[PDB]
Amino acid sequence: IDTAVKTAETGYIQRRLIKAMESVMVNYDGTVRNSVGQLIQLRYGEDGL
DNA sequence: TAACCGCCAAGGGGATTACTCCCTAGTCTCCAGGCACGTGTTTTTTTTTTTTTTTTTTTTTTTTTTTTTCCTTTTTTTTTTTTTTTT
């Protein structure tokens, strides 16, 4: 029952999470930006690694 | 049974006369509360914007793959041809 029930909302959460960050991009200056170019992080993971 | 009347006796105080005196009527003269006029500052009414809960709407529901079965109209009204009866 626990295997059958929660896996619908698990896949829905995975699809929602992959749709929200589908264009969060590391650029050539080391910064992290989305599709519109808004700055999210100056370095990826706050260390650029 | 004592109201009432008649008779008699006694006394108490209101009316009268005179003297006084003192308080108010009258008349100036100054001035101040009583009153006519204007208005107020609270009270009610009305708007105004928000608040808070209720109700309604809308959108969503892991992915991939392989087999069958049933259905993919249907009754209901209108039209048009055919057949039978009559003069």
Curated annotation (Swiss-Prot):
The tandem 7 residues repeats in the C-terminal domain (CTD) can be highly phosphorylated. The phosphorylation activates Pol II. Phosphorylation occurs mainly at residues 'Ser-2' and 'Ser-5' of the heptapeptide repeat. The phosphorylation state is believed to result from the balanced action of site-specific CTD kinases and phosphatase, and a 'CTD code' that specifies the position of Pol II within the transcription cycle has been proposed. It is found in: Nucleus. It comes from the Eukaryota. Signal peptide: none annotated. Belongs to the RNA polymerase beta' chain family. DNA-dependent RNA polymerase catalyzes the transcription of DNA into RNA using the four ribonucleoside triphosphates as substrates. Largest and catalytic component of RNA polymerase II which synthesizes mRNA precursors and many functional non-coding RNAs. Forms the polymerase active center together with the second largest subunit. Pol II is the central component of the basal RNA polymerase II transcription machinery. It is composed of mobile elements that move relative to each other. Component of the RNA polymerase II (Pol II) complex consisting of 12 subunits. The binding of ribonucleoside triphosphate to the RNA polymerase II transcribing complex probably involves a two-step mechanism. The initial binding seems to occur at the entry (E) site and involves a magnesium ion temporarily coordinated by three conserved aspartate residues of the two largest RNA Pol II subunits. The ribonucleoside triphosphate is transferred by a rotation to the nucleotide addition (A) site for pairing with the template DNA. The catalytic A site involves three conserved aspartate residues of the RNA Pol II largest subunit which permanently coordinate a second magnesium ion. The C-terminal domain (CTD) serves as a platform for assembly of factors that regulate transcription initiation, elongation, termination and mRNA processing. This is DNA-directed RNA polymerase II subunit RPB1. The lineage of its organism: Eukaryota, Metazoa, Ecdysozoa, Arthropoda, Hexapoda.
